Each structure stands twice: as C-alpha cells, then as structure tokens.
C-alpha cells in the first residue's frame, strides 16, 4: 500500500496531440492497381545507379505494362574491359521493348507490384 506514483513511464519524449492520426487512412491508399503509368525517370536514373555497382551483360525484361521497356547494361563488346572506366555515355548499351500485353483487352492489377511502392511501413506527419 503506497501512495507514490513511482517511477512509472520515466523520462521520455512528449507526445504531439495535435498530430492526427492519419495511418489507417494511409494504409487504405498504400495500395494501387490496374495502373498503366510509366516508371518515372527519378526510378529510371536511380536504377542506372542502384545496378551500377553490379552492372553486366544481360538481356533483362521490358518490366513495363502499356509503356516502352528499356533495359541498360554493359554493352557486350566492352564487357572484356573494366567496369569502372565503362559509363552510360561512354559503354552503356541499352535497348527498347513494348510491352506485347498492353492490348487494352484485359486488365492487369497492380497489387503484386505494390509491395515496391511501399516501403515496406509507413512514417506519421509532424507538423
């Protein structure tokens, strides 16, 4: 029988009461599908970067539903030579692919392709 509050909770960061809570409304739209928007060039650039580090030869899909697919790799030729001289103006090869399925007769949902728009959580507004 006390009549102490005691430690309790402790020493820790305010709360933000006038923070609204939006995640369930969030999670509602953190899914797309039976879209047929072209990948942005931000993804596009990013990508010469983000397989740069393991950039080679290698035929790779169109990866687009109703948009011209291209794909940029090591250019064969130069393949024998370093890497690291190799550039996307210097050596890169690239090429271009229509999607075959963008007939507009049947629809293609998204909602397998979602888990890559979402980054696997989600962060609350502040202010």
């Known amino acids: 029988m006390k009549n102490n509050q005691g430690n309790g909770q402790g020493h820790n960061m305010p709360n933000d ?8 409304a969030n ?9 047929n928007e072209e990948p942005s060039d931000k993804h ?4 010469l970067n983000k397989i740069q580090n393991s950039l080679s030869t290698e035929w790779s899909p ?17 393949a024998n030579k ?3 001289e190799l550039d996307y103006a ?12 963008c007939s ?11 888990l890559y728009f979402q980054s696997g959580g989600h962060h609350h507004h502040h202010h």
Request: charged share 30%; with cysteine.
């Open 62 to 78: 169109c990866s687009v539903t109703c948009g011209n697919g291209i794909q940029v790799r090591i250019k064969p030729g130069s």
């Open 90 to 101: 210097n050596d890169i090869e690239k090429k271009i692919c229509k999607m075959e399925k």
């Open 44 to 47: 596009i650039k990013e990508y």
């Open 17 to 24: 009461p006038n923070r609204n809570v939006d995640e369930n």
């Open 27 to 35: 999670a509602n739209s953190a899914v797309k599908n039976n879209n």
């Open 104 to 114: 507009s007769v049947f629809n293609v949902v998204n909602s397998s392709e979602n």
């Open 82 to 84: 370093p890497k690291d």
